[PDB]
């Protein structure tokens, strides 16, 4: 009667609590937490006690917390088996990156020809393997990669089943495949490193991050870094960028196809913009208003990170409720982005939301959170937005697209903590005049 108890959401009668619901319909679970509990409720993942926050006030507490109060890395048990930016994300690099991104889109569609069909999952996942490695690690390194790298990295992402809260090394097939894939990536990187040590650049202009790394010496004069550590570093350099860009690119195309008036306006704007003959490295770095608002609304409806988790490293209070040391704390862009009082008609695709009168992203900084907020904002948000603009500047000016299945049949796979499209998700293309 003196101290409150955070209410537990219904369900979760199994021995690991709500874990099984969390690996089938996590968004429905979080929606129930909101509906039954309000701004502060909790659900159970194995032995973990997840305090789910929602609404502007609780979200603000989350996003203002320090890295030392609410610990990010400890909330994600798959990070250890997977793993083992003054660099790429300086604005001075964006123009060069846009050029790289255009080039990779060109390479992906080189052999498309006049007409055909693609699987959205494969297409955007592979494309963003190459954009991510080239922009975030270097073009010299990406040039020494092939599809074997793409497919191993994919299996890493598929190694994120929430069963990792029982045990990140549970003897299940997707975890075995994950760990084998990490070994395969170490082997690819090891061969590349062998070739780099054999051929150190004689011109410092030819050195990339890997050349520097393999040159580093320890106190006995021996290589400080082995292939395992290098692989882990490179995985971590691109892990925040790949699945998010892949999913967001796919859903941007899907929402364009579900809304052909928005598709038409975006195309008309792109054709008129690029009629000045300036290249993608120019336009992708300046305003493309209708495409930008389509992207903002795609992010609102389909945020690639549906939950953001932390481990409490102390006792806290939020809206009169305690959070105890060791409990997990979470915010949910999936739920937050659709709060009706902030986003009228929240389930509807309305890119006008972001135009001057409404500006629903800017005036709801604690509930419009596809990129996070406060002290935990996506550091690659500008790179991610530029990349989408460059990708669709190429794709939509050179090809036109059509759904190959009903509009309502595109859906996400939530079986893993990394979100990706569910099958089927296919689209037709035809080359433009
Ligand atoms: C494509 C759309 C993207 C979205 C919606 C997105 C979303 C987010 C979110 C919500 C966070 C906060 C995570 C948390 O505090 O728990 C975050 C953090 C971060 N993001 Fe992104 N992201 C995207 C793409 C990218 C890209 C392309 C990169 C790198 C080039 C990147 C790099 C990072 C980094 C470095 C952090 C902070 C460290 C971390 O939390 O891992 N993101 N992002």
60: Cα separation from own chain's centroid: 22
Residue 429: helix, strand or coil by DSSP?
strand
Show the 3-state SS of 345-412: CCCCCCHHHHCCCCCCCCCCCCCCCCCEECCEECCCHHHHHHHHHHHHHHHHHHEEEEECCCHHHCCE
Number of domains in the chain: 1
Cα separation, 52 vs 36, in Å, equals 12
**Secondary structure (DSSP) of 152-208:** HHHHHHHT--GGGGT-TT-S-HHHHHHHHHHHHHHHHHHHHHHHHHHS--SSGGG--
Cα separation, 47 vs 166, in Å, equals 8
What approach was used to elucidate this structure?
X-ray
Q: How far is the CA of 7 from the centre of ligand 1 (A)?
A: 30
Phi/psi of residue 59, nearest 5 degrees: -55, -40
Say if CB 284 and CB 389 are below 8 A apart.
yes
Distances (CA, A) of 295 to 221, 279, 407: 50, 21, 18
- 317's CB contacts (< 8 A; 6+ apart) are 323
Cis peptide before 424 (omega within 30 of 0): yes
Pocket of ligand 1 contains residue 70 by CB under 6 Å? no
- Which residue has 């191993």 as its token pair? 152
Token pair belonging to 329: 């704390």
| Percent of the chain that is helix, strand, coil (3-state, to 5) | 50, 15, 35
Nearest Cα to Cα of residue 18 among 163, 210, 187, 176: 163
Take atom 17 of ligand 1 and give the residue whose Cα is closest: 378
- 31's CB contacts (< 8 A; 6+ apart) are 335
Strands (E), 271-336: 308-312, 316-318, 321-323, 328-331
Pocket of ligand 1 contains residue 299 by CB under 6 Å? yes
Helix (H) or strand (E) holding 21: helix 19-22
Token pair belonging to 95: 């123009």
Take atom 34 of ligand 1 and give the residue whose Cα is closest: 379
Region of 38 please: left (phi>0), alpha (psi -120 to 50) or beta.
left
Token pair belonging to 17: 């609590």
Q: How far is the CA of 188 from the centre of ligand 1 (A)?
A: 26
Burial (CB count within 10 angstroms: exposed 0-12, middle 13-18, buried 19+), residue 169: middle
Cα separation, 16 vs 23, in Å, equals 12
Q: How far is the CA of 223 from the centre of ligand 1 (A)?
A: 32
Phi/psi of residue 212, nearest 5 degrees: -55, -50
Q: How far is the CA of 325 from the centre of ligand 1 (A)?
A: 26
Dihedral of alpha carbons 8, 10, 11, 14, sign: positive
Which residues constitute the domain of residue 248?
1-433
Radius of gyration in angstroms for the set of CA atoms belonging to the chain, rounded to a whole number: 22
Pocket of ligand 1 contains residue 371 by CB under 6 Å? yes
Token pair belonging to 211: 């050349």
Take atom 6 of ligand 1 and give the residue whose Cα is closest: 371
Phi/psi of residue 316, nearest 5 degrees: -135, 170
Say if CB 221 and CB 100 are below 8 A apart.
no
Say if CB 398 and CB 371 are below 8 A apart.
no
Token pair belonging to 83: 């793993």
Q: How far is the CA of 245 from the centre of ligand 1 (A)?
A: 10
- Which residue has 């350099």 as its token pair? 237
Pocket of ligand 1 contains residue 24 by CB under 6 Å? no
253: Cα separation from own chain's centroid: 16
Phi/psi of residue 377, nearest 5 degrees: -90, 145
Pocket of ligand 1 contains residue 376 by CB under 6 Å? yes
Distances (CA, A) of 327 to 13, 311, 416: 19, 6, 22
Orientation of helix 120-136 relative to helix 227-258, angle to 10°: 130
Q: Which atom of ligand 1 is nearest to the CA of 244?
A: 1
Phi/psi of residue 128, nearest 5 degrees: -80, -20
DSSP state letter for 424: P
Strands (E), 252-352: 308-312, 316-318, 321-323, 328-331
Pocket of ligand 1 contains residue 384 by CB under 6 Å? yes
């Amino acid at each position: 009667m003196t101290t409150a108890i955070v209410p537990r959401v219904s369900g979760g009668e199994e021995e690991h609590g709500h874990l099984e619901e969390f690996r089938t319909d996590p968004i429905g679970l979080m929606q129930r937490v909101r509906d039954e509990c309000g701004d502060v409720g909790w659900f159970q993942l194995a032995n973990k006690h997840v305090v789910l926050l929602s609404g502007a006030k609780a979200n603000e507490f989350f996003f203002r917390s320090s890295d030392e109060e609410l610990d990010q890395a400890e909330a994600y048990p798959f990070m250890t088996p997977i793993f083992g930016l003054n660099s790429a994300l300086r604005g001075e690099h964006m123009k060069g990156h846009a050029t790289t991104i255009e080039r990779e889109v060109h390479r992906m569609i080189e052999n498309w020809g006049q007409e055909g069909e693609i699987d959205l999952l494969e297409f955007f996942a592979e494309l963003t393997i190459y954009t991510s490695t080239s922009c975030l690690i270097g073009t010299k390194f990406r040039n020494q990669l092939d599809s074997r790298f793409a497919h191993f990295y994919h299996e890493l992402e598929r190694g994120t089943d929430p069963l990792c809260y029982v045990d990140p090394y549970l003897p299940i097939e997707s975890f075995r495949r994950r760990d084998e894939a990490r070994k395969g990536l170490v082997a690819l990187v090891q061969d590349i490193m062998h070739q780099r040590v054999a051929n150190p650049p004689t011109d410092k202009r030819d050195r990339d991050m890997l050349d520097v790394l393999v040159s580093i010496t320890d106190e006995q004069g021996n290589p400080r870094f082995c292939a395992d550590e290098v692989t882990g570093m490179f995985i971590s350099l691109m892990f925040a960028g790949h699945h998010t860009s892949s999913g967001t690119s796919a859903w941007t195309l899907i929402e364009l196809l579900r809304h052909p008036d928005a598709y038409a306006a975006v195309i008309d704007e792109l054709d008129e913009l690029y009629a000045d003959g300036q290249p993608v490295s120019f336009h992708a770095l300046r305003q493309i208003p209708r495409l930008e608002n389509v992207l903002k609304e795609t992010l609102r409806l389909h945020p690639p990170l549906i939950i953001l988790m932390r481990v409490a490293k102390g006792e806290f209070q939020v809206e009169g409720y305690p959070i105890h040391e060791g409990e997990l704390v979470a915010a949910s862009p999936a739920i937050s982005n659709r709060i009706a009082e902030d986003f009228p008609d929240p389930d509807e695709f309305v890119p006008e939301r972001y135009q001057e009168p409404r500006q629903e992203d800017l005036i709801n900084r604690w509930t419009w959170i596809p990129f996070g907020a406060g002290r935990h904002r996506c550091v690659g948000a500008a790179f991610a937005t530029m990349q989408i603009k460059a990708i669709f500047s190429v794709l939509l000016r050179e090809y036109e697209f059509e759904m190959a299945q009903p509009a309502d049949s595109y859906r996400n796979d939530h079986s893993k903590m990394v979100v990706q499209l569910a099958r089927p998700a296919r689209v037709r293309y035809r080359r433009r005049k």
